[PDB]
Ligand binder design. Sequence first.
Ligand code: 529
Lengths: 258, 302
Amino acid sequence: VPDYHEDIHTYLREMEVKCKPKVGYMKKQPDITNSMRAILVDWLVEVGEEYKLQNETLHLAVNYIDRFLSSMSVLRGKLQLVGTAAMLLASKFEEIYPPEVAEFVYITDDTYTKKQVLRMEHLVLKVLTFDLAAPTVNQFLTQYFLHQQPANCKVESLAMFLGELSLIDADPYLKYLPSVIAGAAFHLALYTVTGQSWPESLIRKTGYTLESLKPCLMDLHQTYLKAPQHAQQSIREKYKNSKYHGVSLLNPPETLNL
Amino acid sequence: PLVDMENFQKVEKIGEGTYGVVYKARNKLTGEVVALKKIRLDTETEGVPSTAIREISLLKELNHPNIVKLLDVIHTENKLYLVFEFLHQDLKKFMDASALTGIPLPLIKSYLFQLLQGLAFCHSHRVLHRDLKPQNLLINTEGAIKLADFGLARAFGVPVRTYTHEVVTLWYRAPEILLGCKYYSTAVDIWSLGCIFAEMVTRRALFPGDSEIDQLFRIFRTLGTPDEVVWPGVTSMPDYKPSFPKWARQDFSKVVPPLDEDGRSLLSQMLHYDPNKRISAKAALAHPFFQDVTKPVPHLRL
Ligand SMILES: C[C@H](C(=O)/N=C1\C=C(C2CC2)N=N1)c1ccc(N2CCNC2=O)cc1
C-alpha cells in the first residue's frame, strides 16, 4: 500500500466532482442522442483495440466527449470528429507513444481531413481549458484493487468489464460519479467470481456502504444481464479474450440478494 | 489570443529546447515579469505536442510555492505560449557558480526542505515529475527553490509504464529504472533528490555514469551491489546479471564527509535500493535533519 494512497484518493474524489458533466445535456442537444453516443463510444472501443491503446485512454476520451457535449451543440455529422479529437487528446495524455494524426484520420474513412482533426483538437482543448487529467472509473478501480487481500485477476478483469460497459450508456450512468460506478463494478465482480461482498476496508476508505451503492449496483446488474442483447457489442467481444479471462462469457448471478 | 501576445514585451531569450524557445518578457499593462515558453505548432504538424498536453494539464493542477507557476496559456493558430512566473537562476548554474566556496549547509538544508515540499505536493496529487535534475530546479534572490520542467511528468492514478526514450538523464536515474523495472513509482523522484542533495554537499555529482552499465556500477560501488536480502526480487529484474561484480557498501561518512549523523541518515533513506523502502517526501520532511531549517538567501552572481 503506497504512502500517498489516501491523499490521492481523497484528491481524486475531489476532482471527479469538478470534471462532472451535466447529467441532462443530451435532451438539450438538438441533433444527437444517447443512441448516437453509444454508437460512438462502441466505435472508440474498437479503435482502442485496433491500436492497442490502454483502457484509461478510452475512459479519458469518453470523459472529454461528455464534458464537451455538455456545453457545445454538435450535429450528427460532426459527433465523430469530436470523438476522434477526444481520443487523440486522450492518447497524447495517457499513451507512452500516441498514434500519429494520420491514423486518426484514417480510422474515420476520410470522413474528416487532417486539418479538421487538428482544428477540433484545438477547439476541444479550449472548451475543456486544457484540463485533461480527469478521474476515471479505471483509476478508482485501481485504487480499490489494492484492498483485495486475495488478489484475484478474474475479479479485476470482470470489474474492468463492468466499468467499461457503463461508458456506453449515458442513461443512466451519466448520473453516477466514477468512484460509485467503480464501487458497484467492484462488488458485482467480486460477488460473481468469489461470492464475497464489498469489503469492510473499502467501506472505511470510500465511506460508501453497500446500501449507498445499491441504486448504481441495480442498474449495473441489469446492464450485465442485458449485455448480450445490447445493440453495441465491442466491449463484450474485447472481453472474450484470454487476456481478460473471458469474463464477458461469465454468467451474471440471477439476483444480488442485497 | 493575439491581443494577449501584444501585451507582452520580449526582454531577451533565456533558453532553448526541443519544445521551443523561452523568453523573459514583461506584461506591458501590469509590469509583471514573466517567462514565455514558445511552441511552434508547424514544426511537426502533429497537433499540440504530447509533452505540452501533460505539462499544461498537470501544472495547472499544481499550485504550490515550491512548484513553478503556470500563469497562462495562449493558443493561437500556429503557436502555443505557456506563461510562467520568472525566477533568476537554476540550481545547476548556481552549484557551478558556488564551486569555489560551496553552497553553505543551512542553504542546502533549506533547498532540500523546499524541494521535498514541492515534491510531496506533486505525489499527493498523483503526479510524478520524473526529470529531477539541478537544471530543472529554479531559484530566486529571496531563497526559494521550485520544481520546474514538467515535460516528462505523468499522472499516476493508473500505473505509469517505463519507456526507454522518455527518461531523466543518467546521473539522476534510479536503480530500478536501470535494472529494467516495468513501472515507475514516486521513489524515482526521491532518488534524484538524494543525488542532488549529495552533489550540493560535496560539490561533485554522486554517480556520474558514462553509460547505463557504468551508472549502475558507480551506484553499486558506493552503495554495495544489492542482493535479495537488501532488495527482494532484484536478481529477477530484466537487466540484472548474475555476473555483476559484488561490491561492498562504502562507509557513508566517506561518501558525504561534511554531513552530520542526521544528514547521513536522511540521505541513506533517500538512496534505499528497494523502491518500496525508499523514504517518501512526506516522511523525509519529518526527519530530524530539518529540525532547525531556516530560509537563507543565496549569493546569486548575476
Ligand atoms: C535559469 C533562469 C530561468 O530559466 N528562469 C525561468 C524559467 C521559467 C519558466 C520556463 C518555466 N521561469 N523562470 C534564467 C536563465 C537565463 C537567463 N538569461 C540568459 C540571457 N539573459 C538572461 O536574463 C535568465 C534566467
